[PDB]
Amino acid sequence: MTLKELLVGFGTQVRSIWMIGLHAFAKRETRMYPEEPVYLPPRYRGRIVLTRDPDGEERCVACNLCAVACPVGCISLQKAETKDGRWYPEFFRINFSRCIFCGLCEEACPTTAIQLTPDFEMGEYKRQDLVYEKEDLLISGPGKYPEYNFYRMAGMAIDGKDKGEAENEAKPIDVKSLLP
Amino acid sequence: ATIHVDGKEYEVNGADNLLEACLSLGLDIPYFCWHPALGSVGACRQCAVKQYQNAEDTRGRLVMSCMTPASDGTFISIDDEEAKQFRESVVEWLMTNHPHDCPVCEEGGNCHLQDMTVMTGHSFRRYRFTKRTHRNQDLGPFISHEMNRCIACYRCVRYYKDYAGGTDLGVYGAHDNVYFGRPEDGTLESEFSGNLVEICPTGVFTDKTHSERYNRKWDMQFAPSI
Amino acid sequence: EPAWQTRDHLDDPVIGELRNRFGPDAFTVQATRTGVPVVWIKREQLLEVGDFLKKLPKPYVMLFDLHGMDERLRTHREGLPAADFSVFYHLISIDRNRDIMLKVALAENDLHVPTFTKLFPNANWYERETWDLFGITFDGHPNLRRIMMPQTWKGHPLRKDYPARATEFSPFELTKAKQDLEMEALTFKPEEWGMKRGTENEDFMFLNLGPNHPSAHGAFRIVLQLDGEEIVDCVPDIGYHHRGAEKMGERQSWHSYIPYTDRIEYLGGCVNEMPYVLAVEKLAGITVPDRVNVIRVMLSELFRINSHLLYISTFIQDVGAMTPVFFAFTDRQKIYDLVEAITGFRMHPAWFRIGGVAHDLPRGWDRLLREFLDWMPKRLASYEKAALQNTILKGRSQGVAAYGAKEALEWGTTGAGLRATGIDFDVRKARPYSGYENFDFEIPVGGGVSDCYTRVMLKVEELRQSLRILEQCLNNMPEGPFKADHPLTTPPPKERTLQHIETLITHFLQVSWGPVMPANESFQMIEATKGINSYYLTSDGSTMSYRTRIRTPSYAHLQQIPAAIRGSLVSDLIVYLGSIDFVMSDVDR
Amino acid sequence: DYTLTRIDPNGENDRYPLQKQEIVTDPLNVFMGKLNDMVNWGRKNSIWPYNFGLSCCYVEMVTSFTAVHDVARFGAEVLRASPRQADLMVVAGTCFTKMAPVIQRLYDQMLEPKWVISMGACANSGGMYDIYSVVQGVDKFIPVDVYIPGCPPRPEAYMQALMLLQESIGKERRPLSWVVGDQGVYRANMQSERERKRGERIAVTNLRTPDEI
Numbered sequence A: 001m002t003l004k005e006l007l008v009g010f011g012t013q014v015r016s017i018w019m020i021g022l023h024a025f026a027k028r029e030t031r032m033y034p035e036e037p038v039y040l041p042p043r044y045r046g047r048i049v050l051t052r053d054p055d056g057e058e059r060c061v062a063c064n065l066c067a068v069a070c071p072v073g074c075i076s077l078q079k080a081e082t083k084d085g086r087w088y089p090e091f092f093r094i095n096f097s098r099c100i101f102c103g104l105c106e107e108a109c110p111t112t113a114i115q116l117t118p119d120f121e122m123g124e125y126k127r128q129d130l131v132y133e134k135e136d137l138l139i140s141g142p143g144k145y146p147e148y149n150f151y152r153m154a155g156m157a158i159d160g161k162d163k164g165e166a167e168n169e170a171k172p173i174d175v176k177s178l179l180p
Numbered sequence B: 001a002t003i004h005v006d007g008k009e010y011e012v013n014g015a016d017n018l019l020e021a022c023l024s025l026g027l028d029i030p031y032f033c034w035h036p037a038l039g040s041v042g043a044c045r046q047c048a049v050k051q052y053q054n055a056e057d058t059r060g061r062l063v064m065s066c067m068t069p070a071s072d073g074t075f076i077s078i079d080d081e082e083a084k085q086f087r088e089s090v091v092e093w094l095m096t097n098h099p100h101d102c103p104v105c106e107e108g109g110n111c112h113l114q115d116m117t118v119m120t121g122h123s124f125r126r127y128r129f130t131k132r133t134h135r136n137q138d139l140g141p142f143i144s145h146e147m148n149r150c151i152a153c154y155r156c157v158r159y160y161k162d163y164a165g166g167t168d169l170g171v172y173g174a175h176d177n178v179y180f181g182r183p184e185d186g187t188l189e190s191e192f193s194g195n196l197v198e199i200c201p202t203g204v205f206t207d208k209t210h211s212e213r214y215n216r217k218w219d220m221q222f223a224p225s226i
Numbered sequence C: 001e002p003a004w005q006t007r008d009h010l011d012d013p014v015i016g017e018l019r020n021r022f023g024p025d026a027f028t029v030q031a032t033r034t035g036v037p038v039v040w041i042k043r044e045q046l047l048e049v050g051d052f053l054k055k056l057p058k059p060y061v062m063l064f065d066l067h068g069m070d071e072r073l074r075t076h077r078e079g080l081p082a083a084d085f086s087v088f089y090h091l092i093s094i095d096r097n098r099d100i101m102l103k104v105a106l107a108e109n110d111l112h113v114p115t116f117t118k119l120f121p122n123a124n125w126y127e128r129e130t131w132d133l134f135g136i137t138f139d140g141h142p143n144l145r146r147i148m149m150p151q152t153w154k155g156h157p158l159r160k161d162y163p164a165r166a167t168e169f170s171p172f173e174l175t176k177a178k179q180d181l182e183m184e185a186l187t188f189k190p191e192e193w194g195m196k197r198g199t200e201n202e203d204f205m206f207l208n209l210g211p212n213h214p215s216a217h218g219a220f221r222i223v224l225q226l227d228g229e230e231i232v233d234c235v236p237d238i239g240y241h242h243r244g245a246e247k248m249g250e251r252q253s254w255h256s257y258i259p260y261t262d263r264i265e266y267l268g269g270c271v272n273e274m275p276y277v278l279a280v281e282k283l284a285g286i287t288v289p290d291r292v293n294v295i296r297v298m299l300s301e302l303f304r305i306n307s308h309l310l311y312i313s314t315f316i317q318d319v320g321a322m323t324p325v326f327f328a329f330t331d332r333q334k335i336y337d338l339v340e341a342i343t344g345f346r347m348h349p350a351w352f353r354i355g356g357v358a359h360d361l362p363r364g365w366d367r368l369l370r371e372f373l374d375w376m377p378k379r380l381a382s383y384e385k386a387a388l389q390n391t392i393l394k395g396r397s398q399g400v401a402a403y404g405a406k407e408a409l410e411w412g413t414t415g416a417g418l419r420a421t422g423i424d425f426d427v428r429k430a431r432p433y434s435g436y437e438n439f440d441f442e443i444p445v446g447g448g449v450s451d452c453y454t455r456v457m458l459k460v461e462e463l464r465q466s467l468r469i470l471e472q473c474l475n476n477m478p479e480g481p482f483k484a485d486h487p488l489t490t491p492p493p494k495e496r497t498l499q500h501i502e503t504l505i506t507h508f509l510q511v512s513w514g515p516v517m518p519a520n521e522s523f524q525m526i527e528a529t530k531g532i533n534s535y536y537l538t539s540d541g542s543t544m545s546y547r548t549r550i551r552t553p554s555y556a557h558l559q560q561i562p563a564a565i566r567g568s569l570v571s572d573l574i575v576y577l578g579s580i581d582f583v584m585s586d587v588d589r
Numbered sequence D: 001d002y003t004l005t006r007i008d009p010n011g012e013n014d015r016y017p018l019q020k021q022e023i024v025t026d027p028l029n030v031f032m033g034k035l036n037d038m039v040n041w042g043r044k045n046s047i048w049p050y051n052f053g054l055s056c057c058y059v060e061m062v063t064s065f066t067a068v069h070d071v072a073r074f075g076a077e078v079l080r081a082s083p084r085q086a087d088l089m090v091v092a093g094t095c096f097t098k099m100a101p102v103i104q105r106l107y108d109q110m111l112e113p114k115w116v117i118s119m120g121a122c123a124n125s126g127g128m129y130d131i132y133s134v135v136q137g138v139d140k141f142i143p144v145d146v147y148i149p150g151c152p153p154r155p156e157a158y159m160q161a162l163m164l165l166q167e168s169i170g171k172e173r174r175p176l177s178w179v180v181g182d183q184g185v186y187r188a189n190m191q192s193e194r195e196r197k198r199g200e201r202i203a204v205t206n207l208r209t210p211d212e213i
């Protein structure tokens, strides 16, 4: 090889060594898990919960839109009805060993009941215990959407909400009324 | 008979109206009040198509395909702009008073009204006023009643009276306060009242026996049986 | 007139040349939304048509794609020849900047086509794939064996009667006999490949480079015939990373297939999302507004910088310097902070939608974009001056696995290799998609030799141009909607869904049954992070894809691998593997 | 509250995994227990991963290897390319049908002690790919110690599963020598993380709105 090439290569190796030394004289870029908590954005798609209305009741009406919108098919539920007439999930199970955390169920929820919270620590020893049930998903608050209630928009009569008491709804006019 | 749909020549039966002739050929026209078994009454005004009498005609006339015979020499347009806007407007007028009830409706995913709202392509709401509401009646152990979802298409009363021969279902009310049901509460004593859950395009009459343990149509595993 | 309209494409001069050559009663022209002239030709004239297209004054020098299609279940075939199966050949002329798609119709019993390997040498793996998944035999093919499935596989998986799900078949039971049978199936047999496993002086060495190798970028294996250290021949064995994503496209709805598009090239993300959603918008007839285009360009350039950072760090690691990968992944974490802020996920965002994106931009994204744009160029210059200007790295890189424009064109090589051969063909400039015409950026080209070093430096310049695009889009972002106003926009905007009944109905029927896209064929070709990514979608008028064909560049690059490294050492192969920019989900799909 | 596994490849058992598991009690000795605690600490505080990768989950795993996460702080960075030198197989990627014999071979080529972490929904159950050419979970034919949901799990979730593996190792019983004592492997039946975190997960009331950052 040429002598100039050898000199250029020697200077290049020296320059690389110098830059890695200045890297040693630089600031550390590590986020110290688990000693400092991991910052997660508010819309981060992690662990799935079922939320409640501001009145304190569960916001899910068991409409099965999340289960069919799930491309993986890892949501199972069954609709039950209370005495007043409101719908709720009798059970609600998600196979988290099968879920891909894509957020299509939250996107497809018309009541904002199912949500993907900023939580990633869901490691398990047995994947049978990764099948979360309704007692593991239902939380005691509204979650990311604080002041939305689906039943204030629905035209179905439940407890505490008679016919015509929803938003943008008129009072029910009987057909026996004297007004023309 | 020979008709011309969107410039395409079709051979149809001249004793049928334009709606069943076009639905037989695979052409999608929105419709509510027409049923193959009950007949044509021209109520919902959803089946509008633009009719021309000549091959060289520009204006035309918006007619009801369910009330227009499929005679020889009719030139109809289904996807003309005026007809599509009128059908979208009919869907919009039906959507002005319809409740926000699809998640808590047993007819969701099996709803003719949902399918026809999607087919006309109406997905934006400009109506900002109130929606009328109705009380519900107890129709017995089989049929659940939810009168807010009605679109006043008169299929239920036509079937129940002019076909099944029942005597306790009818139309009551007025201008836009039409009620469909019984004069009081009680069980529908017709022996064929269960077909109301499939005759009704909306979730007014629903299967209460299915509503006890309810799942959607896509979740159902079906079979042909006797 | 919108660009998604069904164009018959009788104004193309290639159609007129084909009429003047083969006559007016030799082929049919199919009107599609592909933007490409689709010519149904007879099986007997296929090689003559290919030779005529290859011998044009500005010829079609590249075989972009070659694959089959099961038309037995296709109800809407008006204006098409009668066929139980079909084979389509997508060809590109760079000189005309034009494409053509030749389709050959086949009956169910007479499933044989003449081979296309003599005209285009890259047709070998495509024809093996078409035989493996559709059962179509290619007469005259040298070695027609399974390329995605193991050799002891019964049935062809992309046929309509084959079950798509694993739950249809028995659950995977690994026994001793099955392990032995599949191990004998996976054992390399050099007599099948004509490898001639010996010489009078010495014996050849058969080495499995992969699946478990640090140099292999996935689950695949190159079987090397060696003498001493020199490579005599290579058999790149793929099919180990097959997820059946096209059969999955026949199994999911139009909206629910987007996460599966995200995992096709797992370093790409939104770059993988864009061609699929653009083809679906072509099917639906959706013209997205300016803000949607700028946001999608933002996310795809961010993920392009991410993928290029991983590629450069990986190349430097395989050359031997193990330091810059840590800093490059720190920059990847900065990009991941921005992407987590916007989409809510790190690496598979699944954030693009039909007619727009999932959400609007959150309040404060420009702060993180400014942070990344300030953090990046000093780090990139440090990487350059520390490792990319290293004479040992240059010795390991320059002149290693070099090919010209002829080898790049005959093997379907796209991306940085094709531009490193001096051919200035980028999709973002030649066929501009998603409003790339509004951005001022340059296309780096090479000097005519596609070295490892040339491809890496071209990707560095592409990273710098993507930084320029990000700066331009940060300084000018429109204030409009993040979703289109089309009725087929899936899903509709969320607040209108939550408080209007029309929007609730549209959302209910679009997330459950799926959007009904009318029966048409659509095609979108984009410049991916590793080359050219294309989606070809056939809709039957239903809520699910009738056919989803995904063309990827890493398939062509891995098929090019034996022709560019034969006769070299194994170290040159290691540098070539590190300097190709491939992942194996991209190859096997 | 322990499970005992004895393996026998040469015995009459055709289906993988070639092992037998029963539910037993803790066998644990004024010094043998302390020496077992010391070797358990040494094994749990020095875990060497196998440089085996299948798909995107491995890309997030090597993202965890880099400087911005520093899994080297746990002593889990050495990343041997040989199965003999590795102690932990992270199945990080899809368990493809064509690679299940390869995965079984590479698991056979590791040496005692060995632990398995399945990373991602593909490795756990097959995930989104319920397709003809994907094994529905790597636990169909290998025993898996730790499962990580995600697609991909973020790198800190990989280090969380590594810490869960360390907690599992730190209270298990293994043969100290291969010439004296029982050769069966005793693993603890620990309480699941779901029931452990159900108290702090249910009580979550309010989160930050998605329009913020």
Ligand SMILES: CCCCCCCCCCC1=C(C)C(=O)C(OC)=C(OC)C1=O
Binding pocket: C213, C214, C215, C216, C217, C218, C219, C314, C317, C325, D051, D052, D053, D054, D055, D058, D059, D062, D063, D065, D066, D077, D079
């Ligand atoms: C331990 C020090 C940091 C290592 C960082 C490695 C980053 C990725 C290297 C490239 C690579 C990829 C992407 C990869 O996918 C792969 O196949 C599984 C490899 O072989 C093991 C690779 O080497």
Ligand SMILES: CCCCCCCCCCC1=C(C)C(=O)C(OC)=C(OC)C1=O
Binding pocket: D077, D078, D079
């Ligand atoms: C009984 C003594 C046991 C000593 C074990 C030493 C293990 C190797 C530590 C240093 C090391 C080497 C050599 C190494 O090869 C390596 O890979 C790049 C490292 O980084 C991940 C290392 O940290």
Ligand code: SF4
Binding pocket: A066, A069, A070, A071, A072, A073, A074, A075, A094, A098, A099, A100, A101, A102, A103, A104, A105, A106
């Ligand atoms: S995040 Fe996606 S994969 Fe997981 S349950 Fe929801 S829809 Fe299904």
Ligand code: SF4
Binding pocket: A059, A060, A061, A062, A063, A064, A065, A066, A067, A077, A105, A108, A109, A110, A111, A112, A113, A114, B103
């Ligand atoms: S989409 Fe929402 S309301 Fe409907 S069943 Fe699922 S969680 Fe319940």
Ligand code: SF4
Binding pocket: B098, B099, B100, B101, B102, B105, B106, B107, B108, B109, B111, B112, B113, B114, B149, B201, B202, B203, B204, C505
């Ligand atoms: S009747 Fe149909 S449109 Fe009306 S609430 Fe029920 S599902 Fe919705």
Ligand code: SF4
Binding pocket: B149, B150, B151, B152, B153, B154, B155, B156, B157, B180, B199, B200, B201, B202, B204, B205
């Ligand atoms: S109750 Fe049903 S069938 Fe009767 S008019 Fe109303 S929508 Fe029609």
Ligand code: SF4
Binding pocket: A100, C263, C266, D055, D056, D057, D092, D093, D094, D119, D120, D121, D122, D123, D127, D150, D151, D152, D153
């Ligand atoms: S779980 Fe998701 S990220 Fe992991 S290998 Fe599967 S597709 Fe890739």
Ligand code: FES
Binding pocket: B030, B031, B032, B033, B034, B041, B042, B043, B044, B045, B046, B047, B064, B065, B066, B067
């Ligand atoms: S279907 Fe014709 S007006 Fe109702």
